[PDB]
PDB file of C-alpha atoms and ligand atoms in Angstrom:
ATOM      1  CA  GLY A   1      -0.166   0.100   0.015  1.00 42.84           C
ATOM      2  CA  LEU A   2       2.209   2.262  -1.497  1.00 40.69           C
ATOM      3  CA  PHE A   3      -0.106   4.127  -3.551  1.00 41.57           C
ATOM      4  CA  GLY A   4      -2.948   3.859  -0.333  1.00 40.54           C
ATOM      5  CA  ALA A   5      -5.601   1.413  -1.510  1.00 39.58           C
ATOM      6  CA  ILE A   6      -5.145  -2.512  -0.835  1.00 41.00           C
ATOM      7  CA  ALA A   7      -4.382  -3.311   2.702  1.00 41.85           C
ATOM      8  CA  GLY A   8      -4.890   0.521   2.724  1.00 43.77           C
ATOM      9  CA  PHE A   9      -8.104   1.981   3.110  1.00 42.61           C
ATOM     10  CA  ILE A  10      -9.944  -1.153   1.299  1.00 41.29           C
ATOM     11  CA  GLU A  11      -8.733  -2.850   4.133  1.00 42.52           C
ATOM     12  CA  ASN A  12     -10.921  -6.168   4.071  1.00 43.88           C
ATOM     13  CA  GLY A  13      -9.910  -9.255   1.709  1.00 43.52           C
ATOM     14  CA  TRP A  14     -12.759 -10.194  -0.995  1.00 45.99           C
ATOM     15  CA  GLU A  15     -12.098 -13.546   0.163  1.00 42.45           C
ATOM     16  CA  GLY A  16     -13.453 -16.059  -2.678  1.00 39.93           C
ATOM     17  CA  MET A  17     -13.551 -13.700  -5.817  1.00 38.43           C
ATOM     18  CA  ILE A  18     -12.655 -16.523  -8.514  1.00 36.85           C
ATOM     19  CA  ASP A  19     -13.588 -14.934 -12.003  1.00 35.71           C
ATOM     20  CA  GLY A  20     -10.497 -13.012 -11.791  1.00 39.65           C
ATOM     21  CA  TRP A  21      -8.225 -10.257  -9.567  1.00 36.55           C
ATOM     22  CA  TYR A  22     -11.110  -7.598  -9.466  1.00 35.66           C
ATOM     23  CA  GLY A  23     -14.411  -6.646  -9.709  1.00 38.03           C
ATOM     24  CA  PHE A  24     -16.991  -4.629  -7.541  1.00 37.84           C
ATOM     25  CA  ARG A  25     -20.470  -5.486  -5.525  1.00 37.06           C
ATOM     26  CA  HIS A  26     -23.250  -3.746  -6.267  1.00 41.28           C
ATOM     27  CA  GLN A  27     -25.772  -2.976  -3.606  1.00 41.78           C
ATOM     28  CA  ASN A  28     -28.991  -2.581  -6.283  1.00 41.68           C
ATOM     29  CA  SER A  29     -32.879  -3.338  -5.652  1.00 41.91           C
ATOM     30  CA  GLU A  30     -31.885  -6.756  -7.491  1.00 42.55           C
ATOM     31  CA  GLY A  31     -30.182  -7.912  -3.755  1.00 43.18           C
ATOM     32  CA  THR A  32     -26.420  -8.171  -4.756  1.00 42.29           C
ATOM     33  CA  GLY A  33     -23.157  -9.477  -6.814  1.00 44.29           C
ATOM     34  CA  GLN A  34     -19.587  -9.806  -6.631  1.00 43.83           C
ATOM     35  CA  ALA A  35     -18.673  -8.966 -10.560  1.00 42.92           C
ATOM     36  CA  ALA A  36     -15.453  -9.807 -11.896  1.00 43.30           C
ATOM     37  CA  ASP A  37     -12.728  -6.987 -14.100  1.00 45.60           C
ATOM     38  CA  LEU A  38     -10.405  -7.428 -16.746  1.00 46.60           C
ATOM     39  CA  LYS A  39      -8.553  -4.428 -18.103  1.00 46.22           C
ATOM     40  CA  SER A  40      -7.154  -4.320 -13.895  1.00 45.00           C
ATOM     41  CA  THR A  41      -6.857  -7.867 -13.347  1.00 44.74           C
ATOM     42  CA  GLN A  42      -5.523  -8.951 -16.967  1.00 45.69           C
ATOM     43  CA  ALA A  43      -3.681  -5.535 -16.322  1.00 43.37           C
ATOM     44  CA  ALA A  44      -1.519  -5.741 -13.465  1.00 44.46           C
ATOM     45  CA  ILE A  45      -1.092  -9.533 -13.971  1.00 44.34           C
ATOM     46  CA  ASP A  46      -0.403  -8.430 -17.378  1.00 43.29           C
ATOM     47  CA  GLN A  47       2.468  -6.340 -15.114  1.00 41.75           C
ATOM     48  CA  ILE A  48       4.341  -9.345 -12.907  1.00 42.72           C
ATOM     49  CA  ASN A  49       4.373 -11.754 -15.726  1.00 42.73           C
ATOM     50  CA  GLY A  50       6.100  -9.299 -17.532  1.00 43.70           C
ATOM     51  CA  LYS A  51       8.909  -8.581 -14.555  1.00 44.77           C
ATOM     52  CA  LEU A  52       9.094 -11.654 -14.076  1.00 44.53           C
ATOM     53  CA  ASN A  53       9.448 -13.821 -17.229  1.00 45.82           C
ATOM     54  CA  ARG A  54      12.545 -11.686 -16.897  1.00 44.91           C
ATOM     55  CA  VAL A  55      13.540 -12.784 -14.122  1.00 45.38           C
ATOM     56  CA  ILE A  56      12.811 -16.508 -14.894  1.00 45.33           C
ATOM     57  CA  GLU A  57      14.026 -18.822 -17.223  1.00 46.19           C
ATOM     58  CA  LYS A  58      17.189 -16.611 -18.667  1.00 46.27           C
ATOM     59  CA  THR A  59      20.686 -16.495 -18.908  1.00 44.85           C
ATOM     60  CA  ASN A  60      24.027 -18.488 -18.230  1.00 44.00           C
ATOM     61  CA  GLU A  61      25.883 -21.492 -19.692  1.00 42.95           C
ATOM     62  CA  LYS A  62      29.821 -21.694 -19.234  1.00 43.60           C
ATOM     63  CA  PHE A  63      31.805 -24.552 -19.957  1.00 44.59           C
ATOM     64  CA  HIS A  64      35.127 -25.089 -18.750  1.00 46.60           C
ATOM     65  CA  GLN A  65      36.425 -23.275 -15.108  1.00 48.65           C
ATOM     66  CA  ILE A  66      38.689 -23.172 -11.982  1.00 49.39           C
ATOM     67  CA  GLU A  67      38.099 -25.610  -9.542  1.00 51.21           C
ATOM     68  CA  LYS A  68      36.642 -25.240  -6.211  1.00 51.87           C
ATOM     69  CA  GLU A  69      37.214 -27.909  -3.405  1.00 46.76           C
ATOM     70  CA  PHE A  70      40.510 -29.343  -2.666  1.00 47.80           C
ATOM     71  CA  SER A  71      42.354 -32.428  -1.399  1.00 48.37           C
ATOM     72  CA  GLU A  72      46.119 -31.641   0.213  1.00 47.90           C
ATOM     73  CA  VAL A  73      47.152 -27.720   0.987  1.00 48.21           C
ATOM     74  CA  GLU A  74      48.641 -25.788  -1.338  1.00 43.63           C
ATOM     75  CA  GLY A  75      49.082 -22.233  -0.226  1.00 42.65           C
ATOM     76  CA  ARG A  76      48.494 -19.065  -2.610  1.00 41.86           C
ATOM     77  CA  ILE A  77      47.585 -20.036  -5.184  1.00 38.18           C
ATOM     78  CA  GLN A  78      44.575 -22.193  -3.532  1.00 37.01           C
ATOM     79  CA  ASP A  79      44.026 -19.737  -1.099  1.00 34.36           C
ATOM     80  CA  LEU A  80      43.416 -17.469  -4.289  1.00 37.39           C
ATOM     81  CA  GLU A  81      41.778 -20.037  -5.857  1.00 37.23           C
ATOM     82  CA  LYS A  82      39.349 -19.800  -3.183  1.00 35.05           C
ATOM     83  CA  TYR A  83      39.129 -16.207  -2.680  1.00 29.83           C
ATOM     84  CA  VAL A  84      38.094 -15.568  -6.141  1.00 29.05           C
ATOM     85  CA  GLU A  85      35.207 -18.009  -6.271  1.00 27.61           C
ATOM     86  CA  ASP A  86      34.652 -16.846  -2.690  1.00 26.23           C
ATOM     87  CA  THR A  87      33.972 -13.520  -3.573  1.00 25.61           C
ATOM     88  CA  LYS A  88      31.576 -14.203  -6.435  1.00 24.98           C
ATOM     89  CA  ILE A  89      29.041 -16.123  -4.924  1.00 26.62           C
ATOM     90  CA  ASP A  90      29.338 -13.516  -1.681  1.00 26.23           C
ATOM     91  CA  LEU A  91      28.578 -10.707  -5.134  1.00 24.55           C
ATOM     92  CA  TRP A  92      26.510 -12.805  -7.070  1.00 24.31           C
ATOM     93  CA  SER A  93      23.736 -13.481  -3.696  1.00 24.27           C
ATOM     94  CA  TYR A  94      23.560 -10.167  -2.974  1.00 27.72           C
ATOM     95  CA  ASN A  95      22.675  -8.829  -5.897  1.00 27.56           C
ATOM     96  CA  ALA A  96      20.298 -12.215  -5.995  1.00 26.45           C
ATOM     97  CA  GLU A  97      19.270 -10.797  -2.177  1.00 27.79           C
ATOM     98  CA  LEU A  98      17.883  -7.298  -3.291  1.00 25.07           C
ATOM     99  CA  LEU A  99      16.732  -8.341  -7.078  1.00 24.51           C
ATOM    100  CA  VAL A 100      14.202  -9.884  -5.187  1.00 22.74           C
ATOM    101  CA  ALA A 101      13.968  -6.955  -2.192  1.00 24.28           C
ATOM    102  CA  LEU A 102      13.030  -4.535  -5.100  1.00 26.52           C
ATOM    103  CA  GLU A 103      11.530  -6.410  -7.456  1.00 24.23           C
ATOM    104  CA  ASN A 104       9.683  -7.396  -4.630  1.00 27.34           C
ATOM    105  CA  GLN A 105       8.255  -4.160  -3.369  1.00 28.03           C
ATOM    106  CA  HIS A 106       7.259  -2.674  -6.820  1.00 27.07           C
ATOM    107  CA  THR A 107       5.720  -6.202  -7.486  1.00 24.26           C
ATOM    108  CA  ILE A 108       3.762  -4.322  -4.719  1.00 22.56           C
ATOM    109  CA  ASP A 109       2.615  -0.840  -5.603  1.00 23.39           C
ATOM    110  CA  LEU A 110       1.674  -2.166  -8.922  1.00 21.34           C
ATOM    111  CA  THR A 111      -1.317  -4.398  -7.852  1.00 18.62           C
ATOM    112  CA  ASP A 112      -2.126  -1.119  -5.194  1.00 18.63           C
ATOM    113  CA  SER A 113      -1.867   1.026  -8.132  1.00 15.99           C
ATOM    114  CA  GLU A 114      -4.573  -0.769  -9.998  1.00 14.22           C
ATOM    115  CA  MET A 115      -7.437  -0.394  -7.244  1.00 11.22           C
ATOM    116  CA  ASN A 116      -6.562   3.540  -6.802  1.00 12.15           C
ATOM    117  CA  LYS A 117      -7.041   3.660  -9.957  1.00  8.75           C
ATOM    118  CA  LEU A 118     -10.022   2.627 -10.519  1.00  7.09           C
ATOM    119  CA  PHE A 119     -12.334   3.844  -8.147  1.00  7.92           C
ATOM    120  CA  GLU A 120     -10.672   6.516  -9.394  1.00  9.82           C
ATOM    121  CA  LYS A 121     -11.937   6.300 -12.291  1.00  8.23           C
ATOM    122  CA  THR A 122     -15.514   5.421 -11.834  1.00  6.59           C
ATOM    123  CA  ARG A 123     -15.201   8.391  -9.550  1.00  6.05           C
ATOM    124  CA  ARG A 124     -14.796  10.375 -12.736  1.00  6.29           C
ATOM    125  CA  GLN A 125     -17.434   9.194 -14.901  1.00  4.93           C
ATOM    126  CA  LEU A 126     -20.234   9.943 -12.907  1.00  2.00           C
ATOM    127  CA  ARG A 127     -20.499  13.194 -10.773  1.00  2.00           C
ATOM    128  CA  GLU A 128     -22.294  14.492  -8.298  1.00  2.09           C
ATOM    129  CA  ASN A 129     -24.472  10.753  -9.329  1.00  3.99           C
ATOM    130  CA  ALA A 130     -23.059   9.071  -6.194  1.00  7.08           C
ATOM    131  CA  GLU A 131     -19.940   8.755  -4.176  1.00  5.22           C
ATOM    132  CA  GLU A 132     -17.448   6.170  -2.426  1.00  7.95           C
ATOM    133  CA  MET A 133     -19.689   5.683   0.869  1.00  8.35           C
ATOM    134  CA  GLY A 134     -17.202   6.518   3.418  1.00  8.98           C
ATOM    135  CA  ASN A 135     -14.975   4.926   2.093  1.00  5.83           C
ATOM    136  CA  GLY A 136     -14.278   1.243   0.957  1.00  6.85           C
ATOM    137  CA  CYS A 137     -18.081   1.373  -1.285  1.00  3.53           C
ATOM    138  CA  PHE A 138     -20.269   3.316  -2.762  1.00  3.15           C
ATOM    139  CA  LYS A 139     -23.146   5.316  -2.337  1.00  3.77           C
ATOM    140  CA  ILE A 140     -26.366   5.577  -5.196  1.00  2.56           C
ATOM    141  CA  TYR A 141     -28.670   8.013  -5.901  1.00  2.00           C
ATOM    142  CA  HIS A 142     -30.185   6.198  -8.708  1.00  2.05           C
ATOM    143  CA  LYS A 143     -32.062   3.041  -8.953  1.00  3.77           C
ATOM    144  CA  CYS A 144     -29.529   1.486 -10.485  1.00  2.00           C
ATOM    145  CA  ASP A 145     -30.116  -2.618 -10.799  1.00  2.00           C
ATOM    146  CA  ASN A 146     -28.720  -5.628 -12.697  1.00  2.00           C
ATOM    147  CA  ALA A 147     -29.027  -3.930 -16.295  1.00  2.00           C
ATOM    148  CA  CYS A 148     -28.567  -0.695 -15.013  1.00  2.89           C
ATOM    149  CA  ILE A 149     -24.869  -1.711 -13.773  1.00  4.06           C
ATOM    150  CA  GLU A 150     -23.342  -2.609 -16.906  1.00  4.71           C
ATOM    151  CA  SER A 151     -22.875   1.463 -16.669  1.00  8.48           C
ATOM    152  CA  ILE A 152     -19.235   2.001 -14.793  1.00 10.78           C
ATOM    153  CA  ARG A 153     -18.890  -2.299 -15.061  1.00  9.20           C
ATOM    154  CA  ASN A 154     -18.596  -1.104 -18.880  1.00  8.65           C
ATOM    155  CA  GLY A 155     -17.694   2.944 -19.228  1.00  7.25           C
ATOM    156  CA  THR A 156     -20.994   2.802 -20.127  1.00  3.72           C
ATOM    157  CA  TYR A 157     -22.831   5.453 -18.066  1.00  2.09           C
ATOM    158  CA  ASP A 158     -24.049   8.590 -18.700  1.00  3.62           C
ATOM    159  CA  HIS A 159     -23.806  11.508 -15.745  1.00  5.92           C
ATOM    160  CA  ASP A 160     -24.806  13.693 -17.880  1.00  5.70           C
ATOM    161  CA  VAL A 161     -27.852  12.155 -19.178  1.00  4.88           C
ATOM    162  CA  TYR A 162     -28.734   9.471 -15.975  1.00  5.24           C
ATOM    163  CA  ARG A 163     -28.190  12.488 -13.971  1.00  5.32           C
ATOM    164  CA  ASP A 164     -31.879  12.998 -12.323  1.00  5.62           C
ATOM    165  CA  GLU A 165     -30.983  12.067  -8.829  1.00  3.95           C
ATOM    166  CA  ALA A 166     -28.760  15.018  -7.873  1.00  2.00           C
ATOM    167  CA  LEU A 167     -28.555  17.287  -5.746  1.00  2.00           C
ATOM    168  CA  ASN A 168     -31.496  16.119  -4.028  1.00  2.00           C
ATOM    169  CA  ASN A 169     -31.065  12.845  -0.785  1.00  2.00           C
ATOM    170  CA  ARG A 170     -27.138  14.662  -0.499  1.00  2.00           C
ATOM    171  CA  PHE A 171     -27.236  17.803   0.622  1.00  2.00           C
ATOM    172  CA  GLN A 172     -31.035  19.014  -0.413  1.00  2.00           C
ATOM    173  CA  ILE A 173     -33.036  16.635   2.279  1.00  2.00           C
ATOM    174  CA  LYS A 174     -33.677  18.298   5.750  1.00  2.00           C
ATOM    175  CA  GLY A 175     -31.629  19.492   7.933  1.00  2.00           C
TER     176      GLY A 175
ATOM    177  CA  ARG B 220      61.207 -43.454  -2.701  1.00  2.00           C
ATOM    178  CA  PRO B 221      58.881 -45.056  -0.020  1.00  2.00           C
ATOM    179  CA  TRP B 222      57.998 -48.767  -1.273  1.00  2.00           C
ATOM    180  CA  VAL B 223      55.227 -48.227  -4.171  1.00  2.00           C
ATOM    181  CA  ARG B 224      53.119 -51.580  -5.426  1.00  2.00           C
ATOM    182  CA  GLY B 225      56.955 -52.621  -4.549  1.00  2.00           C
ATOM    183  CA  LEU B 226      58.723 -50.689  -6.656  1.00  2.00           C
ATOM    184  CA  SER B 227      61.163 -47.654  -4.765  1.00  2.00           C
ATOM    185  CA  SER B 228      62.040 -45.922  -7.563  1.00  2.00           C
ATOM    186  CA  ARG B 229      59.590 -44.094  -9.674  1.00  2.00           C
ATOM    187  CA  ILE B 230      58.830 -41.098 -12.821  1.00  2.00           C
ATOM    188  CA  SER B 231      58.196 -37.989 -13.530  1.00  2.00           C
ATOM    189  CA  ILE B 232      55.804 -37.025 -15.894  1.00  2.00           C
ATOM    190  CA  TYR B 233      56.016 -34.105 -18.394  1.00  2.00           C
ATOM    191  CA  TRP B 234      54.425 -32.239 -21.438  1.00  2.00           C
ATOM    192  CA  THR B 235      55.371 -30.219 -24.600  1.00  2.00           C
ATOM    193  CA  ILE B 236      52.793 -28.937 -27.415  1.00  2.00           C
ATOM    194  CA  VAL B 237      54.464 -28.513 -31.062  1.00  2.00           C
ATOM    195  CA  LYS B 238      52.717 -25.680 -32.891  1.00  2.00           C
ATOM    196  CA  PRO B 239      52.295 -26.042 -36.701  1.00  2.00           C
ATOM    197  CA  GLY B 240      55.689 -25.563 -38.026  1.00  2.00           C
ATOM    198  CA  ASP B 241      57.953 -26.129 -35.373  1.00  2.00           C
ATOM    199  CA  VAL B 242      59.743 -29.102 -34.384  1.00  2.00           C
ATOM    200  CA  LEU B 243      60.041 -31.680 -31.764  1.00  2.00           C
ATOM    201  CA  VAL B 244      63.309 -32.522 -30.573  1.00  2.00           C
ATOM    202  CA  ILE B 245      64.249 -34.823 -27.526  1.00  2.00           C
ATOM    203  CA  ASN B 246      67.438 -34.921 -26.150  1.00  2.00           C
ATOM    204  CA  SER B 247      68.457 -37.909 -23.521  1.00  2.00           C
ATOM    205  CA  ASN B 248      72.149 -39.411 -22.423  1.00  2.00           C
ATOM    206  CA  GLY B 249      70.307 -42.004 -19.874  1.00  2.00           C
ATOM    207  CA  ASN B 250      67.136 -41.925 -17.813  1.00  2.00           C
ATOM    208  CA  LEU B 251      64.670 -40.979 -20.716  1.00  2.00           C
ATOM    209  CA  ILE B 252      61.362 -42.561 -20.817  1.00  2.00           C
ATOM    210  CA  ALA B 253      59.953 -40.829 -24.694  1.00  2.00           C
ATOM    211  CA  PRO B 254      56.964 -40.526 -26.156  1.00  2.00           C
ATOM    212  CA  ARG B 255      55.681 -43.267 -29.310  1.00  2.00           C
ATOM    213  CA  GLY B 256      53.601 -40.279 -30.831  1.00  2.00           C
ATOM    214  CA  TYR B 257      51.898 -36.912 -30.322  1.00  2.57           C
ATOM    215  CA  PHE B 258      47.354 -36.218 -28.604  1.00  3.48           C
ATOM    216  CA  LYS B 259      45.436 -34.294 -30.512  1.00  4.69           C
ATOM    217  CA  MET B 260      44.423 -30.844 -29.822  1.00  3.67           C
ATOM    218  CA  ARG B 261      41.212 -29.876 -29.660  1.00  6.56           C
ATOM    219  CA  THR B 262      38.893 -26.342 -28.430  1.00  3.33           C
ATOM    220  CA  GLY B 263      35.862 -27.350 -27.759  1.00  2.00           C
ATOM    221  CA  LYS B 264      33.506 -26.890 -24.982  1.00  2.00           C
ATOM    222  CA  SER B 265      34.488 -29.970 -22.381  1.00  2.00           C
ATOM    223  CA  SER B 266      35.759 -30.143 -18.985  1.00  2.00           C
ATOM    224  CA  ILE B 267      35.762 -32.595 -16.223  1.00  2.00           C
ATOM    225  CA  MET B 268      34.048 -33.262 -12.543  1.00  2.00           C
ATOM    226  CA  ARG B 269      34.975 -35.130  -9.719  1.00  2.00           C
ATOM    227  CA  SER B 270      31.534 -36.587  -8.799  1.00  2.00           C
ATOM    228  CA  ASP B 271      30.271 -39.822  -7.322  1.00  2.00           C
ATOM    229  CA  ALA B 272      26.150 -39.334  -8.762  1.00  2.00           C
ATOM    230  CA  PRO B 273      25.688 -42.483 -11.529  1.00  2.00           C
ATOM    231  CA  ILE B 274      24.710 -41.320 -15.482  1.00  2.00           C
TER     232      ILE B 274
HETATM  233  C1  LIG C 301      65.411 -47.038   2.375  1.00  2.00           C
HETATM  234  O1  LIG C 301      64.227 -46.829   3.814  1.00  2.00           O
HETATM  235  C2  LIG C 301      63.256 -47.197   3.030  1.00  2.00           C
HETATM  236  C3  LIG C 301      62.716 -47.821   4.804  1.00  2.00           C
HETATM  237  O2  LIG C 301      63.330 -47.283   5.451  1.00  2.00           O
HETATM  238  C4  LIG C 301      63.869 -49.005   2.388  1.00  2.00           C
HETATM  239  O3  LIG C 301      62.510 -49.088   2.404  1.00  2.00           O
HETATM  240  C5  LIG C 301      62.046 -50.771   2.766  1.00  2.00           C
HETATM  241  O4  LIG C 301      62.707 -51.128   1.785  1.00  2.00           O
HETATM  242  C6  LIG C 301      61.842 -52.719   2.539  1.00  2.00           C
HETATM  243  C7  LIG C 301      62.349 -53.871   1.313  1.00  2.00           C
HETATM  244  O5  LIG C 301      63.739 -53.456   1.113  1.00  2.00           O
HETATM  245  C8  LIG C 301      60.575 -53.256   2.042  1.00  2.00           C
HETATM  246  O6  LIG C 301      60.134 -54.325   2.496  1.00  2.00           O
HETATM  247  C9  LIG C 301      59.066 -55.299   2.085  1.00  2.00           C
HETATM  248  O7  LIG C 301      58.321 -54.411   2.885  1.00  2.00           O
HETATM  249  C10 LIG C 301      56.876 -55.730   2.625  1.00  2.00           C
HETATM  250  C11 LIG C 301      55.538 -54.488   3.220  1.00  2.00           C
HETATM  251  O8  LIG C 301      54.360 -54.430   4.498  1.00  2.00           O
HETATM  252  C12 LIG C 301      56.442 -56.989   3.054  1.00  2.00           C
HETATM  253  O9  LIG C 301      55.651 -57.288   2.425  1.00  2.00           O
HETATM  254  C13 LIG C 301      58.217 -57.491   2.302  1.00  2.00           C
HETATM  255  O10 LIG C 301      58.596 -58.285   3.071  1.00  2.00           O
HETATM  256  C14 LIG C 301      59.023 -56.389   2.544  1.00  2.00           C
HETATM  257  O11 LIG C 301      59.201 -56.194   4.269  1.00  2.00           O
HETATM  258  C15 LIG C 301      59.914 -52.097   3.250  1.00  2.00           C
HETATM  259  O12 LIG C 301      58.450 -52.452   2.728  1.00  2.00           O
HETATM  260  C16 LIG C 301      60.088 -50.919   2.611  1.00  2.00           C
HETATM  261  N1  LIG C 301      60.007 -49.814   2.879  1.00  2.00           N
HETATM  262  C17 LIG C 301      59.237 -48.483   2.772  1.00  2.00           C
HETATM  263  C18 LIG C 301      57.847 -47.831   3.812  1.00  2.00           C
HETATM  264  O13 LIG C 301      60.137 -47.926   2.081  1.00  2.00           O
HETATM  265  C19 LIG C 301      64.452 -48.278   1.147  1.00  2.00           C
HETATM  266  O14 LIG C 301      64.061 -49.878   0.599  1.00  2.00           O
HETATM  267  C20 LIG C 301      65.383 -47.520   1.554  1.00  2.00           C
HETATM  268  N2  LIG C 301      66.486 -47.578   0.653  1.00  2.00           N
HETATM  269  C21 LIG C 301      67.430 -48.004   0.712  1.00  2.00           C
HETATM  270  C22 LIG C 301      67.941 -48.350  -0.614  1.00  2.00           C
HETATM  271  O15 LIG C 301      67.969 -48.503   1.352  1.00  2.00           O
END
């Protein structure tokens, strides 16, 4: 949660959303249902499988090298043949033990991105038409339903046309 | 030298490679354990490994 979102302010875990890596939950008149996404689910996983291909299955094929285990005390060259190979392992390790640290931490602020860039999208295609109820979930003024849902859940939403319930239930009702 | 396989004396192995267009010359007045020929010299990609794993 560098971007904040995940494990940030959406502090709840979506239990068993198996139809993908993302989605929504509509509380319309027709009851409920947690819907699955794409351009974000394929989006992130697009990248993860990208930095990875980079890592996994690639370089290095070396044939004849220096010996590294030794049967009798030789001194000098010996010492050296060690210290050289030792230094190698040693370095190569730190490169490894960080390729992870990095790729790993940023693997994160990459998922906690697609989130904080979708709620941040819905909250764009629709004006005063609704607001994320407090935090996490949203709040609607129209009687949106399963059919009406394929609006935002398809970016097919008019905050102009389908606007009727605006000021109203908002700051308009008694107080 | 210590008794090895009966014998108390021994041999010292040495090597010499001759590049195309050069001649080899052996000159001994004793103890020469001369060679019967040359081994071919490849460049390739081979090595050797101490391991007890089975093929
Ligand atoms: C220099 O000294 C060494 C040792 O003091 C001599 O070597 C010993 O030589 C004898 C024969 O000359 C070897 O004896 C045989 O040993 C076997 C092994 O157990 C046994 O089966 C035979 O019946 C016999 O006893 C003995 O192994 C060998 N010892 C060693 C470790 O070398 C060497 O010959 C001496 N050189 C000269 C010119 O004095």
